[PDB]
Ligand SMILES: *[C@@H]1O[C@H](CO)[C@@H](O)[C@H](O)[C@H]1NC(C)=O
């Protein structure tokens with residue numbers, strides 16, 4: 165009850181954090197590890213697991 | 215109103231849900247006014263004013 169104190173909203177909302185996580189997930193599923201070291205190179209998932 | 219010989223409400227620590235002791239008794243809420251700080255967004259003096 166506003167007793168001289170307040171909370172500030174986080175700069176990134178929950179929706180944007182979820183979007184970041186989903187982007188990381190899609191990158192690590194459809195592009196293996198190379199998407200974190202330059203351009204994202206597609207590769208079939210069984211070959212990535214190999 | 216809630217009970218005769220005890221009427222001054224307070225929910226957690228300081229809300230004090232009563233004026234002090236109205237002769238009409240009975241209580242609604244407590245929120246006269248409540249406001250916070252300010253901040254200024256500036257792009258830089260050497261860029262604009
Ligand atoms: C006057 O006192 C009586 C108490 O029963 C009640 O009507 C009220 O609390 C007070 N004010 C008015 C306008 O009657």
Ligand SMILES: *[C@@H]1O[C@H](CO)[C@@H](O)[C@H](O)[C@H]1NC(C)=O
Pocket residue numbers: 260261
């Ligand atoms: C502001 O911008 C101008 C033009 O880009 C630059 O010359 C100057 O060093 C900058 N800083 C200040 C404090 O003026």
